[PDB]
Amino acid sequence: NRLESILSRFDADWTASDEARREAKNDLFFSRVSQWDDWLSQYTTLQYRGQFDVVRPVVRKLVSEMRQNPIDVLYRPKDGARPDAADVLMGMYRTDMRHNTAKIAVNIAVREQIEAGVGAWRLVTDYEDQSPTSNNQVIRREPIHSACSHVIWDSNSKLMDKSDARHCTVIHSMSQNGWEDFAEKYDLDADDIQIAEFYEVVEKKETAFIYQDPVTGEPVSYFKRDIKDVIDDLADSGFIKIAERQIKRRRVYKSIITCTAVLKDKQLIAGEHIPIVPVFGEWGFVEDKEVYEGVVRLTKDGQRLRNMIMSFNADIVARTPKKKPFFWPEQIAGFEHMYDGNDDYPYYLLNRTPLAYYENPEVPQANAYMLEAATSAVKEVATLDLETYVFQDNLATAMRRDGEIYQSIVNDIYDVPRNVTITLEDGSEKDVQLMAEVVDLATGEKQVLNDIRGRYECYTDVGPSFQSMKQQNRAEILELLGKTPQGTPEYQLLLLQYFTLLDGKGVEMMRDYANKQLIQMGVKKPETPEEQQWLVEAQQA
Amino acid sequence: NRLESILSRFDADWTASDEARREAKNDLFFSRVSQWDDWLSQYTTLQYRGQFDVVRPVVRKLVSEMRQNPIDVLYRPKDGARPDAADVLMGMYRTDMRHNTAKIAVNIAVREQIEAGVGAWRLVTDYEDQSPTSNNQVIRREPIHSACSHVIWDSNSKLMDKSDARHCTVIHSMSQNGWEDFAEKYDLDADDIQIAEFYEVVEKKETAFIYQDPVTGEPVSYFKRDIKDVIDDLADSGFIKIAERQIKRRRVYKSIITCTAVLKDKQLIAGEHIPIVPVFGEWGFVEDKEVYEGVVRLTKDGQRLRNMIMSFNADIVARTPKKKPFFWPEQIAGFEHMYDGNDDYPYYLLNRTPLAYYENPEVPQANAYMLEAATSAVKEVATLDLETYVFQDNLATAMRRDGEIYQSIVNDIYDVPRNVTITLEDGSEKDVQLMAEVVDLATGEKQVLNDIRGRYECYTDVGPSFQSMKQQNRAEILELLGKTPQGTPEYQLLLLQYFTLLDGKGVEMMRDYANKQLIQMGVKKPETPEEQQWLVEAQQA
């Protein structure tokens, strides 16, 4: 009976999102296969069906604009978590998003966002460091291709993160080969080929009936049955009722079903949220129906008009310009070897009983402005900001959902003492241990160092990229150097700070000299004992 | 029966990729042989089929624009490997990618990426230093020509690296002569001519059933049979079960088969991955079908329109402009020697019983904008960024796959103490020994120096080339020299650092003087004992 409930929910979601999925699939097929939909091939008579598109330049420009305004993910430390743990999570997320597989997933999701309207990349977990001694795991992102048709979000949820959604499938259209490999890979090779991955979020909601006493109110009456266990204590306490806080606890469950046969895996736990994170284009609710778009429908209509115009011109062209004449069979009764085009004779002969020709088509020459209007419509209705704010905000919201999912999975995996790599800002690689059980020297307590496990909320700061920040800083410092009298310690400090803001391999010695001069000057704090020795040597000099 | 399984897999892959291979072959044939496909030769009547193409200028611009933004491959050192081994692999990959054969392979792959959509160059290994004393091997890259039709990737893999692909053939369409040479070269001259190279990746997957004790959990129950060997120990241990880490181990296998006759070689090992690395153009999944494109389909339609327009013009031109008249045979009964064009007579005679002419075609003069629209479409729909980001990103991803394959092969061949050449950055060539078994002086341990063998993952940094970095550095230093008061040690340091950033042979003497002054100043660290003597001479002076 369980599979009947699963398929009822899946069919409800499918039929509810059918219209949006149809239009998105048509958009994707238009932007990747052929501009000439079947409707258009019915309403037309043109014989040279061509595709002189200007959509892909627009999509490329939009993707490039997004790529040039990178989005970072931060972490607010909550419930008294130390800022250093927040920094460690920021670094681990940065190094798990700079990994090339994650870049491929994000790029595919963005491209299908801009073209179709939905991209929906996915999170997944797997082991590293292949050896049975440990059980270390990492986080990589497998993209979901054509996510407008292979991901069926819960129709009921009404948030763009799809946070409220309590289930979302991932259809896989497998043939025989896909069948046996994706069957032997995980569960069993039991034959029944469209398989599914029905994610699920199960929750436990109660009342918890907080009660108050002279002392601070501890959790009492956690259930309704505990109330019936304290029928006397509820009346013997100082206060009878204060609040009805409905405590909630949730865990994500994953099941692999099939349409015909029974489900293959009943329930499995992986993380806390459903890993699939969707991106959407211009997304909103119209008459209580989810509708999402891209930058391909509008350019699609314009592009169909342009294709029609250019195909019409090509249809005019591909006719031999030589005139075809009209005359009676007895008008050339004998003289038929003259009119073949295989020879050119001085004069043309016609017997007893002057002729009319077949009118070739003429180019309207009014199609100049027509074509220009269509092409300009495609090239401006789509784009032109400095980045399409709606698409950038949508990507930011989806990346924040990705941050929440990644943080929860990190919280639930990074438990065992581990060694991880952290990409601090400015690409500075670093190595950090997670637990670092070392006992303090002057304190006497245990004081585990990092202890990533906690509770965190994600918030993204879209805007000035770090390299752009540094370039603007260098420009400002150079301007000040232009507008400051020389010799004064302010000028020397500004020049030294400009030195320390330079680039890498070429001027490394200048940057190192600047650091030495700053530290021995006393403005920049030392960070290593050699710098401390330099500082004391300069001071005592 | 083995060959039947091989051919089943190969036929499945072939029929699954048939549509994409057909369209890519048509694209390549259009961009290298003749613009006039057979379809167009059916829908047309023009007699002068011409090719006034503007596709190849676009492809040339794109390839050059790639060439001006070179991609480097880096190496993250993992599992506690020293950074010096990482630097040695960095330089070794650089010197194996700067070799001319590798440049030919990469150039052919990129050219076929831009034209057709797939380039798929190939890794291969062979001996150097021909002498039986040793067995040293090197890595060179043999290009695969027309890779859209001679390489059939596994249909089931779903990554642009084709990393997931677990087999991939390489068809060779050989005639008799190719048959005997490619048969005697490796296996045997046993006659059966399309031969194949069926690469394969086999894996061993188990459960490994980690068990935990008071001490750290060592690898126990590596197999399921070892569990049945410890039926007592599993119950006598402190903990019964913690995790089920499915350890995996993979190794490549290569087999040379033929369609009709039996396979020639059953299995051979070469490296760890399948050497073939593909590049793709705009690549994505549409309705669960692999579709990849180039910059030739869109320009292809535009180019067909331009060809038709100019051929129409040329068909108008090639006619005698002399008018051909229409008149009865008895209208010139006697005077037939007048109308031949072989003479020019003063007057023209006509007997008893004024005439009509044959209308030559006229140039519509509306074709000006037609031709301009078609040509401009070809020249802008294709290109215009500063590099086509999708093509550059795909090349970067393929080069990262090349890095992984090269690193696996280097790890698996460079075991014996060898001597290699390293191309450090800025072309500074260097000779380095790999093992360098020298025992330490003040330590007392063995401490092999480089020991390339390890476990590295590749990551590419596409962007500013090193020469561009140096030119920008020189520009910045020159600007500071323009905006800094003279005499001060900062100005002198800037001038000397500008000196040390100059070019080669011409100004070597100033660069050497600058190094001497920097080292005697104490800013740049000495790198050789003569510089140390210079430093102490300057200091004690």
Automatic annotation (TrEMBL), chains A, B:
| Protein name stated in the entry | Portal protein
Q: Which residues of the full protein are shown?
A: 6 to 599 of 725
